[PDB]
Amino acid sequence: EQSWIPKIFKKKTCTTFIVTLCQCGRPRTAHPAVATVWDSDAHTTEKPTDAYGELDFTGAGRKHSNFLRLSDRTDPAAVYSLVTRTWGFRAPNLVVSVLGGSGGPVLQTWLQDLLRRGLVRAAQSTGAWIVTGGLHTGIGRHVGVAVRDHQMASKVVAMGVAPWGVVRNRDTLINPKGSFPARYRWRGDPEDGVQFPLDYNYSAFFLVDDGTHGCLGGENRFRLRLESYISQQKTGVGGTGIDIPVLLLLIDGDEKMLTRIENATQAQLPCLLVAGSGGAADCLAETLEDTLAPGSGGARQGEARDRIRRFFPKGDLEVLQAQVERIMTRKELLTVYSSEDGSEEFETIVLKALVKACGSSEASAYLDELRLAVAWNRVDIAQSELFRGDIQWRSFHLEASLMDALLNDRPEFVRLLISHGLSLGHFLTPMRLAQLYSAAPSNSLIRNLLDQAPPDVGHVLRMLLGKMAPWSDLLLWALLLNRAQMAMYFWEMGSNAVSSALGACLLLRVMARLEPDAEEAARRKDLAFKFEGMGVDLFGECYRSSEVRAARLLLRRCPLWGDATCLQLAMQADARAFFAQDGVQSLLTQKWWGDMASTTPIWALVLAFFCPPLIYTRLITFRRCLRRWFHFWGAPVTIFMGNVVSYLLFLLLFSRVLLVDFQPAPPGSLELLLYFWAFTLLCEELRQGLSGSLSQRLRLYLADSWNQCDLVALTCFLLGVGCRLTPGLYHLGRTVLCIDFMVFTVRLLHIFTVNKQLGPKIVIVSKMMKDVFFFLFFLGVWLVAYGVATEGLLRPRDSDFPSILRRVFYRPYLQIFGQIPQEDMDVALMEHSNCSSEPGFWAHPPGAQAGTCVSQYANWLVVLLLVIFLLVANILLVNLLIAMFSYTFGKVQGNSDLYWKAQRYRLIREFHSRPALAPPFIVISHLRLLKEAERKLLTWESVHKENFLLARARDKRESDSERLKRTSQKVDLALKQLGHIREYEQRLKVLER
Ligand SMILES: [Ca+2]
Ligand SMILES: [Ca+2]
């Protein structure tokens, strides 16, 4: 699989001998028989490489480390092609060449923290490369341990170049046919100062061969050539890609490092220097700090720095000064990274260095910098540098960046790119949308839905909602992928803003209910709440602007979201806060009163209902006569009042029949009328269920508690009729009909839900069930204990299971409500008599169900138990229940009010489609049963949304915190200008004298 590797690469040997010890490092005794000044290329022999393979470090590791030995005189193009194609390494978006000596086995804690936190994280984020020394020493060791720490805390392709000869255990790497299995003794016990082990954190190794036993600086030429070639290469895909930025990071160093950085600046490579690193690196930082310092008093400052910031050797020599001057001749390329007391953030510094290194008006040269800015989450640097207006951009130049920002969840970046005159409509294509949807994160819920379902999002939406403009598509994609800021921005640019917000809330809630992550669902619910709040604010502003237009058209309309009104969307989403606002409540009241004025008094309505001619007077404010009659009798409130009156009459008839007319004889006229009335009620309930996708509407109808109560009442009535008509089940029928009448009477509580001050009371009463159950359980346990103890102590002689159960449960239960049979428990209140032959003394209670006679061995204990039971039950439990009720009532007032306001719409919709006749007469009604304006309204809504967003932005900018930020920036700019003025004044004073 590596046949061409020995052919396209070469290895260098010592060949000639140039002295007992050569400059080549190989002794004359072990020297080729072919044996002034040694020459790297003239005194060497080229041979095929015999050290390539994949290293597998013993112990922990990835079992994959491509190692290659190549001669110094090799074109970097072949090496780069080998890495990109044969080894499968992806084209890097960035190459960072960390350089320096870093004398000392350990480095500063702040420096190591900066390395690990900035460089490795940035490389992981952008998929960069880190090219360092391929040895376990100094900066190579530091970057290796930083990469290891980052890896174990989560990959990063951190390569390494090392000279051939300074590598320990080079004997095990030789296999001409391939070293794919390779064991390396990196943990070797012997230690030496000339050969170093290879780090186990590097993905690849390039062993530069120069025909020496091992030295330093022999890989510098190949390193620089590789960096320069990579700097002039595209990110794969041939010429369709963009250039690969290359940056050099220098930490400490020596004269060799100074020559390296000078050559790199000559080769037009951006460089980055860290302040505080040490010698040979802080010298450049101090020189940049001086900047255009005057020669007078600064000419000797160079020698001063060379003597204080560098070692005494070569400090007096001016060759170092010449190198410094050559470096400063091209100071534009390189920059200095201020420590800033451990900033641990240098992505902005890298972006600034890269943007200042190019210096070209063409936008093609800044594509790599824009991609790096998009990969990171900093937008101020990109806007200030790339989008300063000097660079002329284009839609096709920004399309790839927009795609990358969308895929990588960069909301500020997509906002900025769209803001810069980008045609979104022409940008979006079906293939791009398919890519966006395929960019789902791993095995997410949306990914599962896509797999179950060419995006084919219509099927997913139909299966989620029920199935009963690029901005909309982008909003749907963001909601499906759960991107909060993306969804917010897309909604801000939408057309049907209120409907979009309500549908977004519905979709987020229904997907959170379906999401098994148990943590992403919380974020979905939070985003749904945010969208609901935005919709509430927007609709409130629209209603305050024009009540009629908003209330009429904006809600009662069918958009393209689901072909359902906004009220229906809110009801499905259970957006209680949407119904809580005053505009929605006013619209609901207007619909509830129909064609009648919402200010019509209740007594006037009752008088009109009981006096039909009264509707043709000034009492009620709204052919003409028939129209008025149908308007009055079709209003939902009148339907509700008629239904209430009919239900009261039905209950009265039921009570009359059950109490008087219910006889074992065949049913009379009134009983038949009651049967017909119940049949009509059943027909009405069936109509409600069937017309409330048969299964979906049926289960929606069954979801209401009142509908369940009606169904169970009708079932009980049917069972009662069946038992009554049975020849031998009259009593059972009567009993079950009594229970059914109780259920029908309990059904009457639905009336109070209409009243504004009573519905929340009903909701709170419904919520009191937890406290009720707790009290019931505690009371049941205490009753069981006390009853069993008292029954055991008394020892009544009845000993009958029904009587035992009575004396254990029923009597102590009645003792709670003041029914205390003292004469049945206290022996002192009952006469003594002989009843049983059992030993002891017995007394005869006067009660009928208290037993024939009870024991009187320890009756003071019975009295004490009675006292304790009375205390506990009648005081402690009752007061605890009262306290719990008070606490619950105080706690859930607002939630109950919101729930009532939400269900008010459901009630109004239920009574909007009910037949206009009463249930007794509903049989005949059942038998009879069986553009420019839209665009103007949307423009008005969009204008109001824009005004709301502008007002919110103005409020945010006018806040105290933002004002403090702005004044701090102003003070900083003033200080900078004052420093410039001080320098100018000093220069002018120097020149004048
Ligand atoms: Ca560039
Ligand atoms: Ca019903």
Curated annotation (Swiss-Prot):
Effect of residue 819 to E: Alters the monovalent cation permeability sequence and results in a pore with moderate Ca(2+) permeability
Entry-annotated residues carrying Phosphoserine: 961, 968
Binding annotation for ATP 2: 148, 394, 421
Signal sequence annotation: none
GO molecular function per UniProt: ATP binding; calcium channel activity; calcium ion binding; calcium-activated cation channel activity; calmodulin binding; identical protein binding; sodium channel activity
Short motif (Selectivity filter): ranges: 817-819
Record-given protein name: Transient receptor potential cation channel subfamily M member 4
Origin species: Homo sapiens
Organism phylogeny: Eukaryota, Metazoa, Chordata, Craniata, Vertebrata
